[PDB]
Subunit: 329 residues, 4 copies
């Protein structure tokens, strides 16, 4: 005597609801909403859970997203201040962090993030024993190590956004200069995400043709090196212009989630544990070309860098290991 009861009948047999390709996003900031809508628009998950501390903003983000249900293919959208809402995720994207202040030292900024992460990550793993974590938060190589350390996850189930987007940007700029689509141009920015990112000049190519053998070469002087500078610059340009970053990054992450979710074994420059790789001796995460599958990092692509290069790589590992003087102030 209910509309529902008059209209929907039942088979004698049935099974408790279910979600198998669940993904959870932490933070409903600009990066978070951008990551969440590109995952959605991509049909990577049969469930998406959004987790933030800001009640209002969360519910409202949740709602906006739910109202568009008819236009999507993700069955269940949810949000929670509580972590049990993320219970059963395949993948977790973390985009929650502090943004670095007036007179803040990289040590104090990472320390700040350590005390936020203490509440985030422990709860994720308890509700999602089988998840893989994807750290977006900056500084990414340090926050990845923290997430690793805070969770207790095999090192392969802990990935950092690392140098993916940067490479995505490098390939873009090449393409504009060369006249071919960014997906036909191939070059790699690896190392420590940021100003200290190494551009593998000698891997640069189109079709399989090494730019280096043709330009007579290039690494040292005759305007090409430029290409690396506004990869890291043009990123500050954006901020200065818009007041933040979201679209490119979100897109970047969906790219990573598709590979992971669809067990592709595609090669990505993401932040990994690079201990005793290129003479690095301690527990430092940096970007390397990794194959990804559904259990996270499946393998590492062993580049053949020059010393010039690996030296630089080493300088990052030291510098980062130094910050790793964490657990308070």
């Amino acid at each position: 005597a209910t509309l529902k009861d008059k209209l929907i009948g039942h088979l004698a047999t049935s099974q408790e609801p279910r979600s198998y390709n669940k993904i959870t996003v932490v933070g409903v900031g600009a990066v978070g909403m951008a990551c969440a809508i590109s995952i959605l628009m991509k049909d990577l998950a049969d469930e998406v859970a959004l987790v933030d501390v800001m009640e209002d903003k969360l519910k409202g983000e949740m709602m906006d997203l739910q109202h568009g249900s008819l236009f999507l293919h993700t069955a269940k959208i949810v949000s929670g201040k509580d972590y049990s809402v993320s219970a059963g995720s395949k993948l977790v994207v973390i985009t929650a962090g502090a943004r670095q202040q007036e007179g803040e030292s990289r040590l104090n900024l990472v320390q700040r993030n350590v005390n936020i992460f203490k509440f985030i990550i422990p709860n994720i793993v308890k509700h999602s024993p089988d998840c893989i974590i994807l750290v977006v938060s900056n500084p990414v190589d340090v926050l990845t190590y923290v997430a690793w350390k805070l969770s207790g996850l095999p090192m392969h189930r802990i990935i950092g956004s690392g140098c993916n987007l940067d490479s995505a940007r490098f390939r873009y700029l090449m393409g504009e200069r060369l006249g071919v689509h960014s997906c036909s141009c191939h070059g790699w920015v690896i190392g420590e995400h940021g100003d200290s990112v190494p551009s593998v000049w000698s891997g640069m190519n189109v079709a399989s043709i090494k730019l280096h053998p043709l330009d007579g070469t290039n690494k040292d002087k005759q305007d090409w090196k430029k290409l690396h500078k506004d990869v890291v610059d043009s990123a500050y340009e954006v901020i200065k212009l818009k007041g933040y970053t979201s679209w490119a990054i979100g897109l970047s992450v969906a790219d990573l989630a598709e590979t992971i979710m669809k067990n592709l074994c595609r090669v990505h420059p993401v932040s990994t544990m690079v201990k005793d790789f290129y003479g690095i001796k301690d527990n430092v995460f940096l970007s390397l070309p990794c194959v990804l599958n559904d259990h996270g990092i499946s393998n590492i692509v062993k580049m053949k860098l020059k010393p010039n290069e690996e030296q630089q790589l080493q300088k990052s590992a030291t510098t980062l290991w130094d910050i790793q003087k964490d657990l308070k102030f």
Copy 2:
């Protein structure tokens, strides 16, 4: 003696560049960026041009979007303060408007938008003689009439977002209550977008089963009518929670662009010229189920409303015709 010249050769024959499924978005606000990223993520256009008055914000939005090129399938992304950047668009989405103030009358608010639109729309049509325009801006039914009137476009090449998203929301709420996906539930909210939106109770169905014949009925009293109230409410809820709307709307519009671009002839409740349709006598735009193709509104689905309903429809047409006392203050 250029890398480019050493690496890329030429056929003796070639043809000046080109873009054929060009779309332009006006406004890089929350609705605008949301519309632009869902179109992108959808592969509806081989070119997307973004147009706003805010220099900085535009360039930065443009850039964010360009950096993600590798992850997309839209060849050319551009932005301009100038309208000649939109030269050659198939479709134009307008999301620029004023937001209504402290003590502002709907007449004064529409008047405000009239003086902004005078600079927008005339320029679009001069650069895009063959475009169809899609008005998102609120109040949508009045802003659609203005855009119509300001451009000089056949009435069929002028569409209003109208009541699409609202219906999308109605179908959502049904689905939550019924337990079926929103795309299996069918109901229609038509009329004047907003508080004055008519819910066609008698078209409501699942599988082809009319809810009305089964619930004993319903329109007047026994909690179902509720469903229409928080379709328009839950929309204010969002704002109150998040401070704006974007995702659901953007998604909504991509839905409209796909139909249009792919010449689908799919049925959408969008704002059209409804003169001498349900006894309406003047030049007023309101929502009706329209078939869309690449030249805009192909046809109208002639509902069989009750007087109760059409009366209401008529009350909108009068109320709107009244505002149409435009051209200044």
Copy 3:
């Protein structure tokens, strides 16, 4: 000192290979290859196993298909004369059967198929305890019952192609006559697949508009009924012209596999157990609108047929129950 060893290294950790959305097709005839290439082209399975008795033809079919790997997204293609090759399938499509001879009685033809199926189906279930079976083989309603009976599967994990394609054909013909795409026209052919298929005239509609209320009606005389006759005829037309059927059917089945595999709960007119549904008292399979999910038949859509209709339905159930005098000659 192997190319392979010089080029591919290893993480210290790994896990035994794997296939989770495995589908197996039985028979590499015209229906079988057509079903197998539409599933492939659809990305429904991370593994496809092909099973036939004809060695040569199987290997060669297998190979053709494998050579195109670069163009697909199905990781593993395999074929076997042995059933252990199908070990671990989500879904099994059976397209193996005898074709009915010179002076063969429907009883003798079904008996023929019973003795083939005795070798097929028992082996499938032993290698695939959790599979759902999809019977394509004609006569489908009887072969479905046989497969049901021969396997020992819950009745919900046993589906017959039944009346899906026929409905697909009906919707086509409507569309040609009406001028709208076949997916906008809705009508249902249910009952016993074939000459005895009931056309629900009263469910026929476009947009939600019942053809029956508008044509003054129609079921009895003024050329429309025709529409049902060449749905079943035009099917013999094809054969007479081409010498067999494949494309339409294959396509039909991929449609069923997508729903099943993606847990859609979409409504299909497929052959089900219709005992004590419309006064049918025995163990007979016929076509009804069923919701499908990953465990097979989730529910039944309870049509409201006329007696005229249900009478006909009943005549099938008797006629089929009569054949069910199986187990030899």
Copy 4:
């Protein structure tokens, strides 16, 4: 007083029907039906026209395909014995040819095909002035030259299936041996399609790593060369097993049509005019890596072959130029 008139109304304004991404297939044999269903399944064309001389078979093929309309996204399917049915195609795929007989010389076999093509191709160009032609028919490099010569088309609007599928097969075999997907392995088979196909050993790579530098090398002796032999062999294997080829080829062609139709500028080893390319002096078509767009062959990728290689290339060009003693017997 027609159902149609009671149910479908009209806008005062409209425009004569239309088809813009029309594709036509010639021959409804095994290659032809395989090419036609992969194009369909791919949504590359808003119209597909099928052309063969065999009335019955054509109509029936047409019908099979039409009955599946609901499952596709191609609006209009048609077939004709007449060429005016192909009027307005973007792309034409030719799969009609003779198959070479008991004691037939390659000269007599090409001569046979010349007299069939005289009726095919002239008619295509008259009905489709702006089409590009894709020759599948074997021998492909000679039949491409014939089609070129018979039509009067700019040389860039004439493409041969050439060495695409072979490369697709090579990449497959690599992948099986290496353990990576065929799309991650890259190698090139170019030259004259068939037994005389050159395998560019020195372009072979994974990730960007040249197999040649790692295996110590390889071209001359230590089982790898094998890889080229059963690329051309395993193709005869199929035939011997199945009695023909279809799936892999069809798939291959859809791959070519997508690039062409979507103006991708993707690189394909297809048969082109290779005159005064690698010291070849006459009018001979052979396989080279070409960039394709919507006007056919946009460019050529200038490989750096060894003499060993180019010598071989030259031997083909001579051998083919020799057959080009065509126009009768």
